[PDB]
Symmetry: none
């Protein structure tokens, strides 16, 4: 058995942007109110209240090349 | 058995943008109010209240090349 | 048995845009009010209230090339 | 007198090739025989016999840009 | 007199080759036989016999830009 | 008299090659025979016999940029 795994890649992932800007993200501008009375919990409680995990991602490129080469005998 | 795996890739994923901008994201501009009385929970509780996990993604490119080469003998 | 896997790719995925902008996203502008009284839960509770997981995605390109090359003997 | 020589060149000379090969050049494969008897030469003699100056030129690109910018006052 | 010589060059000369190869050059494979009897030369002789000055030229690119800027007052 | 020689060069001469190889040059594989009898020479003789000056040039690039900037007052 003779196996010759010789893939050739000369590819490009490219971006050109003259200017990038004037980006506004205002998550949670409104008031948050949580009133709790006489509540009962028998197991684990996870609670998130307010402004959490919000993202502003503005990469000049942000380009991705994902590649996988699997040879199984 | 003779196997010759020789794929050739000269591809391009390209983007050109003169200007990118004036982007506004206002998730949760309205008030959030949560009133709870005498409630009972016998098992696990996950609670998210307000403005969470909101995303503003403005990549100058944001281009993607995904590639997979599997050889199984 | 002789196998010659030799695909040739010279393809392009291209985008050109003069200007990209003046994008407005206002999810959850209206008031959210949640009243709960004497409720009973025998099993797990997941609760999301307000403005969650909203996305504003404005890539200058956003082009995708997805490729797969499987050889099974 | 005002002279403004401001030409803008953004040109491209591009070549893309998946594979280049299996090129065979066999000049002068046949027998060469030169029999000369009692010849007389009163002036200069230049002589080439056999297989001379043969060329195999296989550039992966071989692209050419020739440019000239002349201003005379 | 005002002379402004402000040319802008943003050019490219580009080659992309996946593979280059299997190139064969066999100049002068045939027998060469020169037989000379009683020849008379009264001036200069230049003689080349056999397999001379043959070229195999296989550049991965081989691309050229030739450029010339001249101002004469 | 005002002369402003301000040319701008941002050019590129580029080559990309996945693989370069399997190049064979066999100049003068055939037998060479030169038989001479009673020849007469009154001036200079230059003689080359066999396999001379053959070239195998295989540069990974081999790209050239030739440029000239002449200003004469």
């Amino acid at each position: 058995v003779q196996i010759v795994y010789k893939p050739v890649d000369l590819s490009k992932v490219t971006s050109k942007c003259g200017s990038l800007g004037n980006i506004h993200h205002k998550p949670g501008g409104g008031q948050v109110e949580v009133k709790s009375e006489k509540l009962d919990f028998k197991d684990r409680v996870q609670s998130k209240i307010g402004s959490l995990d919000n993202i502003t991602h503005v990469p000049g490129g942000g380009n991705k090349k994902i590649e996988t080469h699997k040879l199984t005998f």
